[PDB]
Symmetry: D2
């Protein structure tokens, strides 16, 4: 369409780069999803999916939908209209989840934080202490707010729920974190965890992956919200029958997920988490060398999947995004809603290595000069490469 | 996984064969859906999509979902809980749509027909005549029942509604018909028409395409059903903003749809419809030469996208499907629910030519012999090839 | 997408052939550095596995980035010197083209000619070997499978005559349209240079000319005074020793493609692949018999299970059948070449193709025969093929 | 997926190079019948468009299914006879290998040698032309861009000396690592045979050796007594007349790939591609200067915009830099070959690659230099390149 020379530099926090082996696995004609091959393939995907959530008790569902669809499935299967939810508004995507909760006629207790801050767990503790009659039925929290680069502590939420002996369900949006940050469903007692295929899993859009605890499944018996396409029970019915699929899945995405999981296990989930931590640290060091500000306001909330960069008031962050596309064949994340024009976002998420990031960072330095910001050329690249030269591990397959 | 020699013969009525040019168009890395390229691509898809529905007034929506999801979008955007619907139970998929309607708390007047018969429009006429107060808010009808190979006359439904001056909405499932059978949204006054990508469009699963009339859009103002992921209003909001996408689409399916539409227009929609008619006629001639019975009970309901073949009571149609897979590398459609074991289904839908079908038909003759049915070898192939030799047009690009 | 037609194109020429989906996937890749550690490691496994399809433990394979005609040229220039006497057999277009090349490289070719549709004249070979008391015949150049005629030669019979007369001539065999489809036993038959092309039964794109040389062939390179650089085996042998294998740049995509192709061949089983080709060839020949047409091959001992050359009656132009197949049925059939131009058309049945694919082609040919005015009985050829195949198609082991 | 590493592999060897996504898509296809009407129609357009990248209206192109070394061989055997005197210039590994081939084909090669890092010695050429009163020199064989050294020769200067002495020798130019990256003017320079390979600036897989011959070169085929069949131009010219173009099977996938590659070249613009390569080469040379290392190229008139050969100090092994790049950074750099083995490493910058890709590589090289104990100032080379590129990168026209 709008071709540019060389390889496009995709550094938005989703969709992310797809590894070549996964592209190959998806390069295939359709197949009959009622043939014996697809149920056999599906069975291996469900079992291996539990490993990336770090659950042995959870039941996964591979919905042909997006992350927004995964949201809807989590809410309508476990809750009823009028049920009271506590959720945390800290950015665009936590906001959009709350907008959805209200639109599905749930009573949402919204706990707001300034953009760049994490969930206000003190207000949470206060609301749980005062909930004698257990009216709060669920906590809905985004693990990683993609709009601001803020990661919340899920274990602290569990500590509060257990401290007050509160039975509320814990629903966690891990779209921007699972397979990039550490995520421990069982240890944290997460009841519904969800992610999307186009983030750290490094696949096309089209899978909304939902993992439910035994507690979450028992809650479906009481749930009076309406659902059909997103109903877990129809999937459970076909799991028992051995066919798994109540309606047609995407054959290509299933084989793609098989190849993505194989690559994840070959690198090692722990090594993937460490890789993201290196990339995020390197990016944050570059941002400080530029004299710019990370939108995250405290170190405890730093995000290793995206860095939201604040520019001074005379610089338009949207112009930085526009110039990256028009001149450097580079995709950067826009500042959304409240931070529109005030930030641009560097995604460091999924299948990406250090030299790819350094190319992006070098390009940002040229863009900032184009818009009149007085950056010392190479200062951010040098801060990142100096740190990375100490920590990049050798590629095991090549030792 | 379970590899077999040669090319797999995919003759289920969905998913269907993907043309090589479409496979190539989808062979690509992710892209930023907020970059200028994707809105530009999307605009051309929405405009060209209207041509296959044969609408100039309708508004299309490209949902990242399946046909079942398209169903849900059509119902929750135009109707409210408790609203009275008339629907026709004639097969598995019309049944599943009714199951969904009931699960979303609509009052469904179910008009049942025996499997192999079309919608009972006499009962419909009777119910419309008696609806003085216009309590019936919508008619939900499957255009082509994939489980039985039955095509209903949509124009007759419009004739009845107009005769009685009845304002009910007309929602039509065209998953199994659009781009294969003739479909005229505006002429028939269809208010919501929907199809899936994995049928005649010959794409992977993952797009539920919904097209709404101005009347359908006005009904959203009154609709009190709950929806977020399937809400048309959020799409309309982003159409006006010029970004089109309220959440992430599948980049690969959008480019795939662009290539699929280009191929459809190059062959010509009218020529595609005639091609399907040839394949269906050829299959029905072969079934009679075999001495077997078409499940469709009257000629007026014949389907040119799938032929449901009835076997005698001592033959297990599921064994025919099983042997096709294990020995001939051939996928045939199973008999579903009420016709389980009594039929098998030959799909002739999407991007498939005459020699492909003749290969399938020759294989069925060998399978029937394997299960003890006394078929005269070549009798069905000969009946089909004798008819096709008179009607196959020359390939225009090669004249 | 040029000259697009609906549905999948039916490729039934005897080369290039259909590529299995997994092989297409394997080649769907960016370039890689051929001097990086990955490519030598990959090449190592291909050379060892390629020996299996030749059925040799003695031979040394070479994966030339070239076509079948280039493999021809390397076979000749590495083992022979100008003026060397060669015995070759003209039985069709491709045995003719090899002989044309032999002459153009200034070899003294003794041409043993047969009618098109017949195999090599071994009685004439015997007398020539019997008269060659001073061993002036340096090589026998014979095509294993003549793709223009559908004729397969008995390679073991040539080795028998060579051994009977105690003649030391090298045995150079073109197996472009036979290896991995017909049985081929390099060591058992004492073949000194065997060659094939990637776009035939291997079911790959064009671009690899695969040559396998016996120790005697390698010994012959020491006395060979023909000129060669691109096709020189010694350059490959040197880089084999060095461990990097490639004296110049190979096709990265074809190396990975060949890896996937060999994996599929070993999964199905080579003996099972040979049997599958036997089924397809017999089914096709039965269809031809049912149609009332004639096989170009004149005797049963010469029938080819990779291609069938069909002779049409005098009032039909075989080229019209090929054109009609392309213009109306999205079907590719082989033309009659040179001597048999217009008198025949060719149905290729080799590589990764199954029985229902072939039956679709055969059904299409019946419709074409009707188009061009041949009084075919519709279904007669399909019924003969299906009646036979319903008895012999094995169950797919992967599906129990 | 062998020896897998995270993220995208950074391919910065000077061949094979990165393939544009649309070209990968174009080659993602099953085989087709090369005797069907589609392939000749496609080939027709490729031959006419290929002339544009050579900047010739007189020349005849040939798309051989071979590598650069095969294009070499065809250039020689079609225009020269054994014993013919050739003047060639040994300035690096690939000019050396061509000379090695010239000798092995029994030509009388007059070798004009220069130190690695220097261009062709034209003063010696002048004296040789001046002494050749009887026109015994039949051809000048010169490499346009020596990929082993990063040295570009002035082809127009050779034509000037040829015309000054009124010498009729043919001008054979290797443009494997120059055409579609550096400027190349076949007609203006009077080049008689120009050749390139697909895996270089054309940004395709290996498998096409593209040769373009002037009318004088074609006239020379009439007197050429070198032996050739696979590489013979006359076989192609005959099928050109017949309208089918191919004397043997081509690679279907590479034909469609070349179609897409040429479409991309015309869309960006050839002059814009030449300018882009100039930017990448200058940026790389600036980085090298900032690092305190030396360019192997000894004079500014010889600098190459397709590859930079970097000389390392005596306490560093250049091969260790290449190994480290592969083992830790998923980066492919070029080795120093033969004479400059261990003394240099090579950064390739040609084909479909943009500035941010190069800058990522340059940033990686700085980290490698630190690993092997070179006192590099982190960011110094990136800053020099970025400071220059921020001035010269053009806006992408497709994006207004
Ligand atoms: C944290 C988070 N949740 C939810 C979403 C919505 O996902 P999708 O666009 O796939 O609907 C996103 C964005 O992709 C996200 O970053
Ligand atoms: C007529 C009809 N409607 C609806 C559906 C359901 O579509 P999907 O499987 O994509 O959810 C099908 C089957 O695909 C169908 O044939
Ligand atoms: C038996 C035989 N030998 C040689 C050749 C020539 O091979 P290629 O076209 O790959 O150069 C062919 C044609 O494919 C052939 O069938
Ligand atoms: C200038 C030059 N000439 C010739 C060659 C040899 O070409 P090939 O490796 O494709 O045979 C090369 C290497 O690519 C080269 O760089
Ligand atoms: Cl042929
Ligand atoms: Cl090189």
């Amino acid at each position: 369409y709008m071709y540019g020379p060389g390889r496009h530099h995709l550094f938005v926090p989703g969709p992310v780069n797809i590894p070549e082996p996964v592209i190959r696995a998806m390069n295939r004609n359709n197949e009959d999803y009622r043939s014996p091959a697809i149920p056999a393939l599906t069975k291996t995907l469900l079992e291996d999916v539990k490993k990336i959530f770090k659950t042995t008790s959870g039941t996964p569902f591979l919905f042909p939908t997006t992350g927004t669809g995964a949201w809807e499935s989590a809410l309508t299967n476990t809750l009823s209209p009028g049920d009271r939810i506590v959720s945390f508004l800290i950015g665009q995507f936590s906001l959009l989840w709350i907008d959805q909760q209200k639109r599905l006629n749930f009573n949402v207790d919204v706990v707001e934080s300034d953009w760049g801050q994490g969930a206000n767990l003190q207000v949470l503790a206060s609301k749980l202490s005062q909930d004698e009659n257990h009216t709060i039925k669920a906590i809905c929290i985004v693990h990683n707010e993609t709009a601001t680069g803020v990661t919340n502590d899920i274990s602290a939420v569990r500590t509060l729920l257990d401290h007050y002996k509160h039975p509320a369900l814990l629903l966690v949006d891990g779209v921007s974190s699972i397979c990039a940050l550490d995520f421990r469903m069982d240890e944290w007692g997460v009841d519904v965890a969800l992610t999307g295929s186009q983030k750290a899993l490094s696949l096309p859009t089209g899978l909304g992956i939902v993992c439910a605890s035994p507690k979450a499944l028992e809650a479906t018996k009481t749930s009076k919200s309406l659902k059909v396409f997103f109903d877990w029970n129809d999937y459970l019915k076909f799991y028992k029958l051995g066919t798994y699929w109540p309606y047609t899945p995407s054959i290509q995405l299933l084989y793609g997920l098989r190849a993505a999981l194989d690559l994840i296990f070959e690198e090692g989930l722990e090594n993937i988490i460490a890789r993201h931590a290196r990339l995020g640290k390197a990016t944050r060091l570059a941002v400080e060398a530029w004299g710019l500000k990370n939108c995250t306001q405290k170190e405890e909330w730093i995000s290793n999947t995206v860095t939201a960069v604040m520019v001074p008031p005379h610089i338009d962050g949207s112009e930085i995004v526009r110039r990256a596309w028009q001149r450097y064949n580079l995709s950067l994340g826009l500042g959304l809603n409240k931070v529109a024009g005030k930030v641009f976002r560097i995604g460091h998420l999924g299948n990406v290595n250090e030299l790819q990031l350094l190319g992006c960072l070098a390009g940002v330095e040229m863009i900032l000069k184009d818009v009149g910001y007085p950056v010392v050329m190479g200062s951010g690249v040098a801060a990142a490469s100096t740190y990375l030269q100490h920590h990049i591990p050798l590629i095991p397959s090549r030792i």
